[PDB]
């Protein structure tokens, strides 16, 4: 099972849903992460240039895939093969973003 995060489209993309796999991988329960930007998964050794490419792609609602260093609730690092894509309505308005961690 691949981890999945769903966020609102605007206002710094607060998380609105995480799947069971996300909780298994990261050690966070939904109530711990709902309403927060997913950046809390990053840590001291996360690559700033990768984070910058994510920031630019999401701002422009452009799909992006990056291998990024993240951290579990307990502080242990894990590699995240991360794919983020906008969810659009038929007018092209962005309704949400979906992030998937591919394991592999």
Contact residues toward its own copies (CB under 8 A) are: 1-2, 4, 6, 16-17, 19, 65, 81, 83, 85, 87-91, 93, 95-96, 98, 100-103
Nearest to 75 by CA among 5, 9, 26, 35: 26
Q: Are 31 and 53 in contact (CB under 8 A)?
A: no
CB of 46 to its own copies, least distance (A): 20
CB of 28 to Na ion, least distance (A): 18
Other beta carbons within 10 angstroms of residue 94's beta carbon come to 15
Q: Are 82 and 99 in contact (CB under 8 A)?
A: yes
Which one of residues 5, 18, 25, 33 is an interface residue with ligand FMN (CB under 6 A)? 5
Which one of residues 39, 62, 77, 93 is an interface residue with ligand FMN (CB under 6 A)? 39
């Amino acid at each position: 099972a691949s981890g999945m995060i769903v966020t609102d489209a605007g206002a710094d993309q607060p998380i609105v849903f995480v799947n069971r796999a996300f909780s298994t991988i990261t050690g966070y329960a939904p109530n711990e992460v709902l309403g927060r930007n997913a950046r809390f998964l990053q840590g001291p050794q996360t690559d700033a240039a990768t984070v910058a490419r994510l920031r630019e792609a999401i701002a422009a609602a452009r799909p992006i895939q990056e291998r990024i260093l993240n951290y579990r609730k307990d502080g242990q690092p894990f590699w995240n093969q991360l794919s983020i894509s906008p969810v659009r309505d038929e007018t092209g308005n962005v309704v949400a973003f979906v992030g998937v961690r591919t394991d592999v």
